[PDB]
Each structure stands twice: as structure tokens, then as C-alpha cells.
Prior knowledge:
CATH superfamily: Luciferase-like domain
Order of helices and strands: EHEHEHEHHEHEHEEHHEHEH
CATH topology: TIM Barrel
GO molecular function: alkanesulfonate monooxygenase activity
InterPro entries: Lucif-like_OxRdtase_MSMEG_2516, Luciferase-like_dom, Luciferase-like_sf, SsuD_RutA_monooxygenase
Largest sheet: 8 strands, parallel, barrel
CATH architecture: Alpha-Beta Barrel
Keywords: Flavoprotein, FMN, Monooxygenase, Oxidoreductase
Organism: Kitasatospora viridis
Structural class: alpha/beta
Amino acid sequence: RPFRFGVNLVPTPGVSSWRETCRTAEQSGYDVIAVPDALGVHSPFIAMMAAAAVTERVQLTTFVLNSAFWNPVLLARDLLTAHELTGGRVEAGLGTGYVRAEFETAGLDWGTAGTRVTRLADTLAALRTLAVPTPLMVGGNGDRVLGLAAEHADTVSFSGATLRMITAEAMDERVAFFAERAGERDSQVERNTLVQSVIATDDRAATAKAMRSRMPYLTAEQILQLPTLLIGTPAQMAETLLERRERFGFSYVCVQERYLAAFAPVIGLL
Length: 270
């Protein structure tokens, strides 16, 4: 599947640079602007509308909605609106939330991991029943969550962390688990991952060795294979993404805002 590149931008209250940042993302060659769903961050669909007003090509996605925050019928109303009023430029990533304090602040029941995943399941079923027109992305690494992606999603997003970084070998197993659950639908589901750090260096080996300090549970060789890290020159990173599309099927690759400019050269090469 052809590469699609995203940058995960944080629209921040009290900061006046949102539209400028979105323009920079598009001008730097990104295909997608992703926004989070968190307290103390701008509201996602409203921020996506502001981004759509100053960009022409990028898709806009949530990455990812906290399912505890949304009534499925009212979310379907939001998604239909966002789709129609942007000319079909909005995608909706959904998942579970991991910050209990946000549940507490909003007056929502934290419950159990089981009830949080059931809420995601119930929302996805309702959105599909209501035939929402936005493409749906499901993110996580849990067995039930990947099963829900396999059943419902247009795009599955594999987390490269639990932050504890997951090895390439663990990622092999998660992608295979998803693929088995997806069955005949596997080929219709785009695969995404988020790269946490884009580390430009002329000495990847020396860089990985020093990084064992921050990831003592890994060898340097494992660090150089972690799907959540890109290390080296732009040419080396481009080659690494080609290899990881072959290995994992990852064609939709996102990076964090801090690395927007660091990663842009890789887009130029790919």
C-alpha cells in the first residue's frame, strides 16, 4: 500500500500558532494532520475545522478519541458534520483512554479495562450502524482492541509502546494477531503506527548504544529495530520505513510534532 505520512499536532489553549502550524505541516509534505483527544487540549473536531480552513490537501484525523468522552449517537452527528462541511477530509481514530485523572475530572467512571474496551466496542458498532461516512481508525495493542479493529476499522493503528518500547518481535506478533482476527478483511485494512522519535545522526550504531541508558531492557540491536524509533540519515530512515512496510505492513506512518521538520526529508525521499 502506498505510503501516507502524518504529524500528530497538539492544538494548545493560549497559544496563537495553530493555523500557522497546520500550514507548515502541509507545506512540509505531510498527508495527514492528527490531533489528540485530551483535557487541557483544544477540542478535536473544532481544531480540525480550523485546520481544514487553512489547508487544501491534508486529511484531518483524531488520534485517537477517548471513547469514554463521546456519546455514540452524538459522535455520529459530529462525524457526519465534519465530513460534509470539509468535503470529505476527516477521519476518526478511536481508542480507550489511559489517564484516569481525565475520567475523574470529567466526572466519568474509570471502571475496568474490560468496561473501557466494551465502551469502544459499543461505540464502533453504533457508528457502523449509523453508516458514518468518515473512515474509522482503531488504535491500541490489546487483544480485544485489535479484534475490534479487525471487525470494524478502515485503519488499524499499532502502538509501539505500553513509556515502554515494544520490540520488533513483539510487534510481529501483534500484527499477526490482528491479521488472523481480520481474516478475509485483512487486505482492506490500512496499517498505521506512530514513531515516537526521529533521531538524525551520521552514527546510528553509536546512537543506539547510548540510548540503552533510556531503554536498559533492550540491546542496541533491538533498539535499531524498534518500530517506534527512526535513527540515522534521511536515506537510512527511508530505507528503514521501506523494510518495515514489508515486515509489518506499516504504510501509514505518523510522527510527533517535535519531529515535524526532522522527518520532512524522509517524505521527500519516499
